[PDB]
Ligand binder design. Structure first.
Ligand code: HEM
Ligand SMILES: C[C@]12CCC(=O)C=C1CC[C@@H]1[C@@H]2CC[C@]2(C)C(=O)CC[C@@H]12
Length: 452
């Protein structure tokens, strides 16, 4: 059927689109091009032809099949952040990825998913008893920081459990995410002029070194153990795999790093948007509070509760649909294939614009926030907040458990208020690697007034 998109200008076509991605940010540029040209179109990042697609049918084909189980990005950028053929997130070596993923899949389901519900609640409780760490003179809570701090504490106590400087690591993680987002699609030219990136190089060293201290301690505790099998975790599994010849030390270290940053990166921003939505939708917030009374009372949250929290589940789904954070997914074609009548050569980059997809396709009221969008069972071939298939979000199930547990134990205790007019729509956003608040602006704080 041939491929819609801007003209190749004897080598200038590519330069404009790349430059546009650099100026605009990956997210907004994807939205720009899907709006101007079709919902399935072609662009260039560096040399490579890269398709940006919002069509749900294309989405489904791509995530369903093994020959798309890869992402893309600057080799120089990925090596720089330590994700070139090393973690899982942007590990683009198919075999190395294939054998690393199982470790993440195991730690993020089964017994660990069950522990996580209570670990989360206890972590948030402990931090809500310490609001003095995060509250203003005028009573303003820095929710973003609060959330990141518990999200890290959660991840640590589950996957690594080694005592750490919470506040410091949180800042370093933000530093890391920046470098990652900055360098991911910079052209090779950029990496020549060195005073243009050593800024980021230092953020990566900051976190990596901080995590080595932690892994080093974890190695010692493991080497002298009252028999291991009585307390396995994600970090130990990796280290034992490395003592068999299955894993590389560097690779082990990147995995632990990726496991620690994941929730602080995505969950906190997600829950923040969720909290602002609750503040602005009193009717929805009452439904949730009533559901909590009916299902939980004043008991501690337990695993058997989470299925029963139907209203909240819908809230989480709608929040994510309406105000996403991870609104785009990056892939690469590993074999040739024809998809929706379009020829897709192997080596072709893909960006699935799931945020735009969720506004064009299935839902009754796409462009407004309502639980009405989830009054009837949503097919999942029209709603992919996490992705599905051989490379879908590794933490897709545990994420819903964590989001429920923290939302429950927060709202259970506090009413949340927004400052001035502020709502998710009025928040100034950066739309690049993910969709998140521009933190150089202000009025991002909240007021946590008690209940009863
Ligand atoms: C609301 C929070 C989250 C959202 C919206 C989210 C969404 C996503 C999406 C859309 C992907 C891409 C899937 C694909 O390529 O088809 C992804 C990948 C991934 N996510 Fe999540 N995720 C969340 C939370 C988490 C958590 C809590 C963890 C673990 C602690 C996690 C770990 C990962 C990993 C390791 C990958 C890379 C998978 C791979 O390439 O093999 N995510 N996430
Ligand atoms: C969910 C995620 C991993 C855990 C983490 O630490 C932070 C993020 C945000 C960026 C996500 C990424 C997963 C892969 C994604 C979906 C892409 O293919 C483009 C954007 C990117």
């Amino acid at each position: 059927s041939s491929i819609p998109g801007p003209g190749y200008c004897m080598g200038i076509g590519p330069l404009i689109s790349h430059g546009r991605f650099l100026w605009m940010g990956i997210g907004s540029a994807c939205n720009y091009y899907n709006r101007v040209y079709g919902e399935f179109m072609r662009v260039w990042i560096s040399g490579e032809e890269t398709l940006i697609i919002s069509k749900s049918s294309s989405m489904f084909h791509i995530m369903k099949h093994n020959h798309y189980s890869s992402r893309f990005g600057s080799k120089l950028g990925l090596q720089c952040i330590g994700m070139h053929e090393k973690g899982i997130i942007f590990n683009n070596n198919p075999e190395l990825w294939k054998t690393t993923r199982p470790f993440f899949m195991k730690a993020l389901s089964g017994p660990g998913l069950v522990r996580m519900v209570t670990v989360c609640a206890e972590s948030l409780k402990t931090h809500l008893d310490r609001l003095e760490e995060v509250t203003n003179e005028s009573g303003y809570v820095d929710v973003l920081t609060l959330l990141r701090r518990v999200m890290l504490d959660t991840s640590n106590t589950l996957f690594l459990r080694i005592p750490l400087d919470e506040s410091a690591i949180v800042v370093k993680i933000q530093g890391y995410f920046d470098a990652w987002q900055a360098l991911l699609i910079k052209p090779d030219i950029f990496f020549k002029i060195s005073w243009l990136y050593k800024k980021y190089e230092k953020s990566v060293k900051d976190l990596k070194d901080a995590i080595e201290v932690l892994i080093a301690e974890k190695r010692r505790r493991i080497s002298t153990e009252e028999k291991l099998e009585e307390c396995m975790d994600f970090a130990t599994e990796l280290i034992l795999a490395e003592k068999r010849g299955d894993l590389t030390r560097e690779n082990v270290n990147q995995c632990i790093l990726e496991m620690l940053i994941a929730a602080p990166d995505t969950m906190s921003v997600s829950l923040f948007f969720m909290l602002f939505l609750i503040a602005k939708h009193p009717n929805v917030e009452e439904a949730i509070i009533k559901e909590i009374q009916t299902v939980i009372g004043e008991r501690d949250i337990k695993i058997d509760d989470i299925q029963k929290l139907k209203v909240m589940e819908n809230f989480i789904y709608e929040s994510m649909r309406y105000q996403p954070v991870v609104d785009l997914v990056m892939r690469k074609a590993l074999e040739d294939d024809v998809i929706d009548g379009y020829p897709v050569k192997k080596g072709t980059n893909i960006i699935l614009n799931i945020g735009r997809m969720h506004r064009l396709e299935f839902f009754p009221k796409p462009n407004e926030f309502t639980l009405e969008n989830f009054a009837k069972n949503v097919p999942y071939r029209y709603f992919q907040p996490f992705g599905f298939g051989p490379r879908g979000c590794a933490g897709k199930y545990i994420a819903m458990v964590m989001m429920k547990a923290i939302l429950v134990t927060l709202l259970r205790r506090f009413h949340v208020k927004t400052l001035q007019g502020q709502c998710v729509e009025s928040i100034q956003k950066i739309h690049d690697l993910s969709l998140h608040p521009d933190e150089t602006k202000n009025m991002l704080e909240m007021i946590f007034t008690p209940r009863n």
